[PDB]
Write a protein that binds this ligand. Structure first.
Ligand SMILES: *CCC(=O)N1CCN2c3ncnc4cc(-c5c(C)ccc6n[nH]cc56)c(Cl)c(c34)OC[C@@H]2C1
Ligand SMILES: Nc1nc2c(ncn2[C@@H]2O[C@H](COP(=O)(O)OP(=O)(O)O)[C@@H](O)[C@H]2O)c(=O)[nH]1
Ligand SMILES: [Ca+2]
Ligand SMILES: [Mg+2]
Length: 168
């Protein structure tokens, strides 16, 4: 019947992964979401006139390697790489998330999107141009998002879907 996409949302602790995913699915902003909850969220959506199913895995757990986490990641068709623009270490870590995904996919061209989250915060420490240059060198799109104001949430997930469709 209707297509399903496995989206995986990766990024450092407290970048807004669950806030983004919950805003897309449930249309509200979470203030203090339980940071151990790793669950899968679904939504029916119309993208370029195609009704589709989003299965969104919102990563949590521990900073540790597991055979079981390789398996969940290998099921993923595309990945949002999320940093907050007020945390330069969250952006320093994007490199390791891309490396870890290349290892399990044993692929250079995995549908990915770079997300600079918390675009509403005054206190920016990571500059758009640097984020842009990183996405241009990975060959992936870049979207600035605020889970609070909902700016760029839709277009971040939809751009990932459109990256997975271009992939075959
Ligand atoms: C506050 C908790 C939270 O949101 N976290 C902390 C734990 N991680 C995390 N931290 C470090 N390394 C990680 C590595 C992977 C991973 C990847 C990308 C591919 C294959 C893997 N095999 N074992 C682990 C991994 C992931 Cl998915 C995470 C992670 O998930 C994010 C999460 C963020
Ligand atoms: N101001 C602002 N706060 C955010 C945004 N996204 C998440 N937060 C807050 O940042 C903290 C971490 O968010 P969370 O979604 O739990 O991070 P996760 O560890 O990636 O799941 C929370 O207290 C959120 O309310 C955002 O876009 N703007
Ligand atoms: Ca453990
Ligand atoms: Mg979380």
């Amino acid at each position: 019947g209707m297509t399903e996409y496995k989206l995986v949302v990766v990024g450092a602790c407290g970048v807004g992964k669950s806030a983004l995913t919950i805003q897309l699915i449930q249309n509200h902003f979470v203030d203090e979401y339980d940071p151990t909850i790793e669950d899968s969220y679904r939504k029916q959506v119309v993208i370029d006139g195609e009704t589709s199913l989003l299965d969104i895995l919102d990563t949590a757990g521990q900073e540790e390697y597991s055979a079981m986490r390789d398996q969940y990641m290998r099921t993923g068709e595309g990945f949002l790489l999320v940093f907050a623009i007020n945390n330069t270490k969250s952006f320093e870590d994007i490199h390791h998330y891309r490396e870890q995904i290349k290892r399990v996919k044993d692929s250079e061209d995995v549908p990915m999107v770079l997300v600079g989250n918390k675009s509403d915060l005054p206190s920016r420490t990571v500059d758009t141009k640097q984020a842009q240059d990183l996405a241009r060198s990975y060959g992936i799109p870049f979207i600035e998002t605020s889970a609070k104001t909902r700016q760029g949430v839709d277009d971040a997930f939809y751009t990932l879907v459109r990256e997975i469709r271009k992939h075959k």
